[PDB]
Design a protein that fits this description.
heterodimer; A: mainly beta; Immunoglobulin-like; 2 domains; seven-stranded mixed beta sheet; 2 helices; 19 strands; 5% helix; elongated; B: Immunoglobulin-like; five-stranded antiparallel beta sheet; binds chloride ion; immune system; variable domain; constant domain
Amino acid sequence: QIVLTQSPAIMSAFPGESVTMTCSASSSVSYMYWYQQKPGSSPRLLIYDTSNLASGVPVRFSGSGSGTSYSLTINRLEAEDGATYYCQQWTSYPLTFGAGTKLELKRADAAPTVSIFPPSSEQLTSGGASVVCFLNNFYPKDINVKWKIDGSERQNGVLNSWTDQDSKDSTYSMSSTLTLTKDEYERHNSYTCEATHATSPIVKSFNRNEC
Amino acid sequence: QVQLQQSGPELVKPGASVKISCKASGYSFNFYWMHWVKQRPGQGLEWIGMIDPSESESRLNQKFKDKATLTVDRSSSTAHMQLSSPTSEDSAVYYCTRSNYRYDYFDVWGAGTTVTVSSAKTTAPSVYPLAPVCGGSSVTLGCLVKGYFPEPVTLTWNSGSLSSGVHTFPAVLQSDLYTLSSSVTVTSSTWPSESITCNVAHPASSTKVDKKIEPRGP
Ligand SMILES: [Cl-]
Ligand SMILES: [Cl-]
């Protein structure tokens, strides 16, 4: 029942920065182990017996510590290093991991490329109507997407999904889907999706049945 | 050539036991302990327990004492984990992972088995084309995969031949059904003269659909 407490929970840095994350154990441990988990893959051993690098782990990674306090350092972060990092103890059963530090990357601010799509004919035959907007290749992650129907904000029926940070260009992308009934879709004219963060918003719109 | 091969995604209804398998290869099976690890969103990594294949000695995390049963089939170099009376709390990715002979670490991992414990019905998606309205250097098209259960679906563009400029967004669950979408961006002169088709498979419902993205007109 050795509880491992990792801080910070979430962090980000530019490539080139030195980053350190800590793992505090509720009672003394003999060694700390560190695992790296990139989104969508299995955890992989990074550092064992406190400071020994696993086979193939580059020299930018180091581990240190003793007693109840341990740390992992990445000296000159690289874009590929985005992952969640877990410490792990093998001093007493049950074996435990910390809750992880999710490390992401910083880059230059980038505006999204925004594309809007009306309901397909196919969907309309089923009696439903979804309007979709893609906000692609932007930074930072925390963008606001706002839907308007005939110029009134619509918040109900909006489903958003972000991609994991891109491991090559450090951008995010998101898809926003507004679902209405066909009946409701057919009684309004303009559909707009608006992307804002800090200043001018990016606005894409269409008018139903105006071809 | 050290590997751990895990079984595919499982859907089970609450109360119905689930068994997942982990086939080892490229090493001498009896010499190494096999561990199991549970991963749920927001809940990091939890160690379930371990088993010695040599004589099937096992040790479990007390948290899972009445939940998980670990066995091995020495003849087929396969470890199994069985979960009794599952609830939605048992939905997770489960990894098997081998411990190093000399050191206290996990040195090879399987790819994980995703277990969904749900009473929701297996449902086929509807796949809808996303083309821009009537009428830049590029054009973005898309594909909306709406209303399936359980995960996963697989989505490709032009059978896998269009792989760059793609964003396929993680599914989102709403009222027992998932919805996913994908975007593809090409040079503005590429489409519609070159066809672009979304290929979607949902193995659970034996659904395989190709949807050509057609331009919108009057
Ligand atoms: Cl079913
Ligand atoms: Cl749905």
